[PDB]
């Protein structure tokens, strides 16, 4: 629960809590950065009443483009590295969303996903975001560290959505087809830290079954010296795997033994050349082995012990891939759905006001004398009620008119309007029969959504 | 050190200041259901003092504690924990709400009758200090009797500082050595939230004519005998700030330790029921008053409060007087009255100014709507109103603003009665600002009103 992903979403309840607080408070893209303490306090205020770490530390994690595939906060000042760096206090930082953060929490303001009342009962929150790309295969969940519960992999944006057009595209499909065609599109996990995947099983045993292991490696690259002397230079690492703590265990293995072809380390990285590790090896040693020996002796080589476990109708399940994808599109289908439900219920409220308008501009006149004739409001809003044939919500509608209204290129504004609700509702309706609409819906929101945020694979492959 | 010193006109140092005023422009107000404290924490967090230590919720608890402020300013439900060491329910766990007395620091604060300043991240305003409607840092005081405090102003009984300030409204002119005889007239003494006694004059007159003194005070103490001649002594009030289970252990220590010989139990038998209730029972051949004696040379039964007025005044700290303290305030309130009747006059014009122009739109309203129905746009129709009533932008748009209610006869009439009315407003609050005794008349009564709904009996008996 704290511990696994929602399905539909990718999300536990403290980043979902930030990334709602956050959005509710208007920190989005288009706006400057907020200090990340108004995001921590609205978030400890209204939905997790605690002093404790958890919530700012989830808004760094998720500003941080080492650790999530898709950033879904961007931070700006001191949010850490890929090492030992510390992140600077949340009165030193500020973030914002993302762009596909705003992807994640798109229209949940029309009903959209079920709420909640929150801790204290005096507002909602929500049990689920709407989630309009696939973030729980794009940024994963868990981690390859010991004790965590779940261990699912993040993948490419543009590989998951293929596999998400395909099971639109293909609703009658059974489980077999489904999951050949989605193994066909997903090639593997796609770290943000790219790197390689050495072999095939182990993705394909993940993708089958819930479970498999994965080895990952960094990519090394060699360099002469003009003394002659060679060194390994190492510019990718597996994902998770400490910049600072993988140095130091190259140090400590020297030590203890292991690796003596290796005659120096310097930590060469910068922000400019991005990691550059370079280990001098002995005049007497052969650089290939020495990068074997690497693989043995650190996490130059680490294996990613992908464990599909998420939280599916409060349940949790180990799911293959295949299940991954249909329950995130049947999620989709709910989201437009009722978001078409949703506008289609305020459509006919619009409408319904519209036309009673209409019926006073077209007895304005009339209208006018009525409510200066009458002695009080409530005398008025009765005769409007009798003289045009309206209900008392059109009345009212028409009592709280404005002067500046009645301007001609206002007045035909009413009318403009009411001819293009109705054309609105006549398309909602339609949406609503049709589910072949509703698949292009979400067909093409996300086909937009990917070609704007979309990007290369990172990690390589190699069967 | 703006840490450590309250300002001198509203008695706060800036977390306190900024809670309050969170929790009032969060409507946590004393008419409506408590909100859980963790609310008031976040939202004085994210707008005021962006910190993630306790020292808010920590400003918020001791606010809400009856034993710790004379006139607590936080109405909380919960466990705010106790005059002893019991820790108080963390923040989801307990709810706050401002008291009626709080409401009086910050009423009409959205008069302009204080400066604000822009917060740490320059997204919103916040006060410099409240309105400040009753004495509050002569009634709640600021600092601490301990050791090493950087202040220490003792809280007073408010009926009684309301009777310094009205004298020091009529007075407005006395000088100092006239002043300072007069309140020190009418403010007693401290008057703590914990009761208990004050021994002698001299302390609390030093305090008050020159800042420093050394106030004695003194818990309650009774003897309890039988006819087979076991006795006990019942503590039940103590000092100010004397932390009940710190004392009890003092006790244990000082009888381990060799003092306090005619000792043989203690216990502490305080429930909700009777209140404080230390019971410390006598050996058969000690005499219970020679007991009680070496209590108060031993323990802090009887403890100094040693007064320390020193307050923040126009930014610079000052070791100041009973005369000083009061005056000061009074220069506050004066400046909130006038303050607020320059804010609701310049308000009053503005209406006056946007009637006048409805008034004209309503005597040629058949020219007026048949100006704006003819009109293209709404721009068009705003110069035409200009041009045709001969009036400004601004009223051309409240008119262009009007709703179609508004035009029914009772609030047509309503629009022309609000103009005259608002007129006689307008005269009555330029009277206020050509009259300095009117505005202090104003203080006074109001200051009367909240004395007279909030003020209550002295808990602190001082004696000889």
Not at 52 to 64: E, N, T, W
Not at 158 to 184: I, K
Not at 259 to 282: H, P
């Amino acid at each position: 629960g704290r511990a696994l992903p929602e399905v539909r979403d990718g999300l536990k309840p403290v980043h979902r809590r930030v990334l709602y607080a956050m959005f509710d408070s208007g920190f989005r893209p288009d706006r400057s950065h907020a200090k990340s303490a108004r995001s921590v306090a609205e978030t400890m205020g209204n939905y997790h009443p605690h002093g404790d770490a958890s919530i700012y530390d989830s808004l760094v994690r998720m500003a941080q483009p080492w650790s999530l595939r898709y950033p879904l906060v961007d931070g700006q000042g001191n949010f850490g590295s890929p090492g030992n760096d510390p992140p600077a206090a949340m009165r030193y930082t500020e973030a914002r969303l993302t762009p596909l953060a705003m992807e994640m929490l798109r229209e949940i303001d029309e009903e959209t996903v079920d709420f909640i009342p929150n801790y204290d009962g005096r507002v909602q929150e929500p049990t689920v975001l709407p989630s309009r790309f696939p973030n729980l295969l794009a940024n994963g969940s868990g981690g390859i560290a010991v004790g965590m519960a779940t261990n699912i992999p993040p993948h490419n944006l543009r590989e998951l959505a293929d596999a998400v057009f395909w099971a639109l595209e293909n609703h009658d499909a059974d489980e077999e087809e489904t999951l050949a065609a989605v193994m066909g599109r997903v090639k593997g996990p796609d770290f943000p830290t790219a790197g390689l995947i050495v072999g095939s099983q182990g993705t394909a045993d993940a993708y089958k079954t819930g479970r498999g292991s994965i080895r990952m490696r960094g990519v090394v690259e060699v360099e002469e010296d003009s003394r002659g002397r060679t060194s390994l230079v190492i510019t990718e690492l597996p994902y998770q795997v400490n910049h600072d703590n993988f140095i130091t265990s190259i140090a400590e293995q020297v030590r203890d033994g292991k690796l003596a072809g290796i005659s120096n380390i310097e930590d060469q990285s910068s922000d400019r050349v991005g990691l550059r590790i370079v280990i001098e090896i002995k005049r007497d040693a052969v650089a290939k082995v020495v990068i074997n020996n690497l693989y043995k002796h650190t996490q130059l080589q680490t294996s990613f012990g992908a464990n599909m476990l998420a939280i599916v109708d409060g349940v949790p399940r180990t799911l293959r891939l295949d299940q991954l994808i249909r329950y995130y599109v049947d999620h989709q289908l709910d989201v437009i759905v009722r978001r078409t439900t949703y506008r289609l219920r305020k459509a006919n409220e619009r409408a319904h006001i519209l036309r009673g308008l209409v019926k006073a501009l077209d007895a304005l006149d009339e209208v006018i004398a009525l409510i200066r004739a009458s002695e009080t409001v409530d005398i008025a809003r009765a005769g409007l009620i009798e003289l045009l044939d309206i209900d008392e919500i059109q009345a009212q509608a028409i009592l709280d008119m404005q002067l500046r209204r009645l301007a001609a290129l206002e007045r035909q504004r009413i009318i403009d309007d009411l001819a293009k609700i109705e054309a609105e509702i006549a398309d909602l309706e339609d949406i609503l029969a049709k589910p072949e609409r509703q698949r292009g819906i979400v067909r093409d929101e996300l086909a937009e959504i990917v070609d704007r945020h979309g990007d290369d694979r990172r990690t390589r492959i190699i069967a």
